[PDB]
Design a protein around this nucleic acid. Structure first.
Length: 64
DNA sequence: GAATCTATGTAAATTTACATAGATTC
């Protein structure tokens, strides 16, 4: 696992550092579309858990 | 406070694209 995960991270990082502007823009656009649909399709339970995590993070940022 | 976007990790189909956590933007 560690040997696989380390090598996976190396491959990913290597791809990322060599991305063209266009490749990065595409990847980010796809991620923002993915997040937006996840947000659109959230259940009431998922929404509540998310808002609680976000308030926890905000409080944490506030304290440091 | 909450919407929105993104850096990071890695499950699943070497490379894609998913998924989470958390950072930014409003």
């Amino acid at each position: 696992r560690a040997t696989r995960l380390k090598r996976m991270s190396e491959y990913a990082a290597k791809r990322l550092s060599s991305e063209t502007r266009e490749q990065r823009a595409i990847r980010l656009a796809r991620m923002s579309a993915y997040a937006a649909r996840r947000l659109a399709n959230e259940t009431p339970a998922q929404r509540q858990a998310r808002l609680l995590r976000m308030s926890a993070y905000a409080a944490k940022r506030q304290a440091s």
